[PDB]
Amino acid sequence: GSHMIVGGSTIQPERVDAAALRQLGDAMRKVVGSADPTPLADLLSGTPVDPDELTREVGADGRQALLDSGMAVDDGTTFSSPLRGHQLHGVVVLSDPDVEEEVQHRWYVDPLWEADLLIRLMLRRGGARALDMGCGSGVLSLVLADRYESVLGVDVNPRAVALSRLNAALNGLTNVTFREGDMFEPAEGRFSRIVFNSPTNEEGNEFVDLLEAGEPILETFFRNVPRKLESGGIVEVNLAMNDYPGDPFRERLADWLGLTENGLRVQIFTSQRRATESGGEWKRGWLVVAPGPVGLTEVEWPYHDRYEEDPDALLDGTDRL
Ligand SMILES: NC[C@H]1O[C@H](O[C@H]2[C@H](O)[C@@H](O[C@H]3O[C@H](CO)[C@@H](O)[C@H](N)[C@H]3O)[C@H](N)C[C@@H]2N)[C@H](N)[C@@H](O)[C@@H]1O
Ligand SMILES: Nc1ncnc2c1ncn2[C@@H]1O[C@H](CSCC[C@H](N)C(=O)O)[C@@H](O)[C@H]1O
Numbered sequence: 120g121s122h123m124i125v126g127g128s129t130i131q132p133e134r135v136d137a138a139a140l141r142q143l144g145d146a147m148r149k150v151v152g153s154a155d156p157t158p159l160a161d162l163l164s165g166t167p168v169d170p171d172e173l174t175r176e177v178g179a180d181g182r183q184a185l186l187d188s189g190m191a192v193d194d195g196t197t198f199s200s201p202l203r204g205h206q207l208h209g210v211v212v213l214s215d216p217d218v219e220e221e222v223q224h225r226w227y228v229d230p231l232w233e234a235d236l237l238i239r240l241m242l243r244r245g246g247a248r249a250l251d252m253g254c255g256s257g258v259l260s261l262v263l264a265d266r267y268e269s270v271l272g273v274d275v276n277p278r279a280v281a282l283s284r285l286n287a288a289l290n291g292l293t294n295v296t297f298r299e300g301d302m303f304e305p306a307e308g309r310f311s312r313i314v315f316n317s318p319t320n321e322e323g324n325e326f327v328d329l330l331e332a333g334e335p336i337l338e339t340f341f342r343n344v345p346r347k348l349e350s351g352g353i354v355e356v357n358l359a360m361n362d363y364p365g366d367p368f369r370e371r372l373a374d375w376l377g378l379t380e381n382g383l384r385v386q387i388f389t390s391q392r393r394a395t396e397s398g399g400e401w402k403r404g405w406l407v408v409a410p411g412p413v414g415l416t417e418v419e420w421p422y423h424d425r426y427e428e429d430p431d432a433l434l435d436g437t438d439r440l
Contacts, residue, residue: 126215126227128201130189130278132285139184144211144289146177152206163204165216167197188285202282205231205258208238209265212286214256225328226278229255229316236426237316237357238262239433240405244353249312252340254297257283259314264295272297273306276329302336303343311352315340319359321401334361341375344408345383354408360387363399373415376408384411388420388437407437 132140150160158172162185170193174182185191190213191198202213217230238259245266251259254272260283264270272283272295283297298305317340322331337358344354360368369387376383389404405422418440425432 122222123224125201125218125222126224126278128189128192128278130281130285132188132281132288134187134189135184135288137288137291139180140188140285140288141291143177143181143184143190144291146181147204147211147289148206150176151204151211160204162191162198162200163202163213165200165203167194167199169196170198173198190285203230207235207258208262210258210261210286210290212256212258212261213282213289214258223328223330226276227330228276228279228282229330231256231258233316233357234258235430236422236433237314237355237405239426239430240422240437241314241355242353242407242409242437243435246311246352247349248308248310249314250306250310250347252302252306252313252315253318254283255279255316257286257295257297259316260295260297261286261290261292263312263314264292267312268294270295271306271310273300273302275299275301302339303347306347309347309349309352311349313344313348313352313354315354315356315358317356317358320403321359323361338371338375341372345377345381348408351410354406356406358404358406360389360402360404361395361399362402363397366399368402369415369417372406378415379413382413383408384413385415386437386440387415387417388422388440389417390420390422390424405437 150157158168158176162168191200203216205212215228215230249263249267249270251272254260254274260270260272277299280297280299287295318330318332320331322333324334326333362368385408387404387406389402391403393401
């Protein structure tokens with residue numbers, strides 16, 4: 120048909136018993152991320168697999184649970200999966216494979232481009248109630264679930280809600296809730312923790328799709344953050360920022376947050392930057408709202424480079440700062 124097919128597959132965990140899902144999840148903990156792929160690990164890496172082999176490893180029920188949830192598809196001979204398995208930070212996560220923009224369905228889910236990294240940037244603290252805006256595959260929500268009494272994930276992509284729910288089910292996590300909706304609209308009450316791996320990269324002000332929504336989505340997030348955040352609470356945001364001549368991002372951010380009016384402390388840790396036509400600058404960085412002296416600070420923290428060199432060096436970094 121048309122070429123934008125990756126990310127349109129039907130995902131339906133509610134079609135399977137939660138016990139079957141937690142068993143499949145247990146099979147996945149054994150083999151996903153381990154070299155010399157078993158049948159199940161190779162299925163979750165995108166290779167066609169004989170169901171005979173797959174059956175010996177997860178059972179006949181496990182084999183049906185893969186088909187009924189949509190984790191696998193029966194060609195005729197073999198089984199294939201439209202998703203990819205990951206195992207990190209104590210959790211097992213499925214998501215779409217990493218592929219080029221041009222073959223991305225409008226419901227394509229973040230293939231975990233920065234999730235492992237952002238999880239290492241996250242303050243290791245815990246508390247009452249966490250929110251994960253744009254939760255995608257649910258990966259950030261599943262991690263936070265370990266140190267928060269409850270976690271709410273929100274995404275406007277109904278495929279990502281289904282996938283998030285599947286992944287929670289695979290890990291047998293019971294304190295995680297996902298809702299479909301537009302930004303804060305289904306997030307009732309306040310939160311002691313808010314995390315946002317934002318849909319922003321090189322699109323500037325332009326809305327391109329659900330993964331690159333333009334600066335307007337950041338303005339909405341940050342304008343509404345003060346009424347969503349508990350006193351003493353913590354916001355963390357992965358984002359792309361654009362500085363234009365006489366028009367720096369950090370100032371637009373201050374207005375959105377009502378920085379002085381709300382008494383907020385905001386630090387931006389900038390990791391990558393490149394000059395643009397307009398004479399201004401593109402940045403990628405990590406923004407944290409946390410308690411302390413009212414104001415906005417910006418530092419250079421090349422955490423993308425230090426990640427390539429030694430990932431565990433990033434643990435408790437924002438705490439040290
Ligand atoms: N190497 C090939 C890949 O290159 C691009 O991948 C980008 C990611 O997009 C970007 O992720 C960030 O930008 C997304 C929007 O682009 C946001 O939604 C997301 N929250 C945010 O973390 C990473 N930082 C860097 C990576 N090079 C393409 N997009 C992708 O199709 C392609 O396979
Ligand atoms: N208006 C909106 N309301 C809620 N989520 C939105 C949104 N617009 C885009 N998003 C979501 O924001 C997510 C950004 S990608 C990050 C996904 C996941 N948290 C991870 O780290 O891997 C996407 O899933 C996208 O669907």
